[PDB]
Ligand binder design. Structure first.
Ligand code: HEM
Length: 88
């Protein structure tokens, strides 16, 4: 995965709501591994993350009409990497 692209895509598009890997809209639905295991539909895995970034969920906007496939893949990988290595 192009983690470099993923990080810049993250800062540019997701940081207002998830700065520090947290969540400013619904505080407990952070991007930490344990939180995603509880709140992310499908659990903590790349497929679940990609699905939500593409399709959206409630106050979480859908990005399929803003970011392209290679950009979505990149950002999903970055989020997974950050969570599993707890790099936030
Ligand atoms: C940017 C493109 C972006 C990413 C990446 C992203 C990811 C993401 C994940 C993986 C979750 C799940 C967290 C969990 O614990 O279940 C999640 C959830 C929400 N998001 Fe998000 N998100 C991105 C962008 C944005 C933006 C710009 C906003 C703010 C307007 C935002 C908000 C939210 C909200 C609210 C949720 C919770 C969804 C729900 O379960 O109801 N995200 N995001």
């Amino acid at each position: 995965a192009d983690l470099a692209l993923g990080k810049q895509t993250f800062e540019a598009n997701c940081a207002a709501c998830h700065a520090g890997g947290n969540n400013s809209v619904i505080p407990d639905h952070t991007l930490r591994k344990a939180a995603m295991e509880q709140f992310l539909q499908g659990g903590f895995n790349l497929e679940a993350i990609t699905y939500q970034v593409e399709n959206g969920k409630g106050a979480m906007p859908a990005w399929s009409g803003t970011l392209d496939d290679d950009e979505i893949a990149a950002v999903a990988a970055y989020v997974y990497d950050q969570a599993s290595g707890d790099k936030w």
